[PDB]
Write a protein that binds this ligand. Structure first.
Ligand code: HEM
Length: 291
């Protein structure tokens, strides 16, 4: 199965910047969500989970088909809580019914990262909705209770290498774990709706204790009130990951650049872009537009 990007008919950069802007304005407006964290983090996670079902071996799953809209995928236990991101995007889709679902879910993530003062993420249009029977089964998203070997092997299926994995994990600066949603509780840091390299700094610099939470799962906790999942912590247990964590803790621009590449790649896995497709778009933030 080849998934060829097909530009929504007649649309160009300005159309998608209008969608960007509507997402960004609603992100600003709907600020109460999740104890005033706002929807940025869950939109980033929605983009990732709708992309991260991809299997490089047979091109099943991935962002192209926008299959999260079907009940098997929106009810994946691994996706618990993402319905909030979907509901956020609903009025956006109603205003711009021409955008594909995959394009909207992925654009939500780009918009969230950028509006949270993260790197620019080039974004390409052209995902096309595919039917219900193309929805990937549950179980393709990763477990959190595992070690570095798990993480490394997991991400090979998404064609990500060590640097790409450690960069992508930096998105765990954002938002928080919610006990009822996954069995883990707590934020990873203080700046959880501003995109920074704090995840790496906290991994290296907090004093972590291995504790059990109220769902009887182990997680790493600090006196500052932060947590790390076992898979996060694996990034400093494994010496290869550790080196990269230290790099990003010590170079914010490098983290931004590597995250941007890896996140675009994640959002584009499985899609074939014709030779004459438009170049990737780089959207202006609301701030850059004076909006
Ligand atoms: C080994 C890989 C990963 C594992 C096991 C993992 C696991 C988790 C878990 C358990 C949660 C908490 C869900 C909840 O209780 O609300 C979470 C939240 C989150 N993850 Fe991941 N994650 C991984 C990779 C990633 C990647 C690659 C990204 C995106 C680049 C990402 C972005 C997020 C965001 C932004 C949140 C916060 C969501 C919110 O506040 O609502 N994660 N992750």
């Amino acid at each position: 199965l080849v998934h060829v990007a097909s530009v929504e008919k007649g649309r160009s950069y300005e159309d998608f910047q209008k969608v960007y802007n509507a997402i960004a304005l609603k992100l600003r407006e709907d600020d109460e969500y999740d104890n005033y964290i706002g929807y940025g983090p869950v939109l980033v996670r929605l983009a990732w989970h709708t992309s991260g079902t991809w299997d490089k071996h047979d091109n099943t799953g991935g962002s192209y088909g926008g299959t999260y809209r079907f009940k098997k995928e929106f009810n994946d236990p691994s996706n618990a809580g993402l319905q909030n991101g979907f509901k956020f995007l609903e009025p956006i889709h109603k205003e711009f019914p021409w955008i594909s679902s995959g394009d909207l879910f992925s654009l939500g993530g780009v918009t969230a990262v950028q509006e949270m003062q993260g790197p620019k993420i080039p974004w390409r249009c052209g995902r096309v909705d595919t039917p219900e029977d193309t929805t990937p089964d549950n179980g393709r998203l990763p477990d959190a209770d595992k070690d570095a070997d798990y993480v490394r092997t997991f991400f090979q299926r998404l064609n990500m290498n060590d640097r790409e994995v450690v960069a992508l994990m930096g998105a765990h600066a954002l938002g928080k774990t919610h006990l009822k949603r996954s069995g883990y509780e707590g934020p990873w840091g203080a700046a959880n709706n501003v995109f920074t390299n704090e995840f790496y700094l906290n991994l290296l610099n907090e004093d972590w204790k291995l504790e059990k939470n109220d769902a009887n799962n182990e997680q790493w906790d600090s006196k500052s009130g932060y947590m790390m999942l076992p898979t996060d912590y694996s990034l400093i247990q494994d010496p290869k990951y550790l080196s990269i964590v230290k790099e990003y803790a010590n170079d914010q621009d490098k983290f931004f650049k590597d995250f941007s590449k890896a996140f675009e790649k994640l959002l584009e896995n499985g899609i074939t872009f014709p030779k004459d497709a438009p170049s990737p778009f780089i959207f202006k933030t609301l701030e850059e537009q004076g909006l």
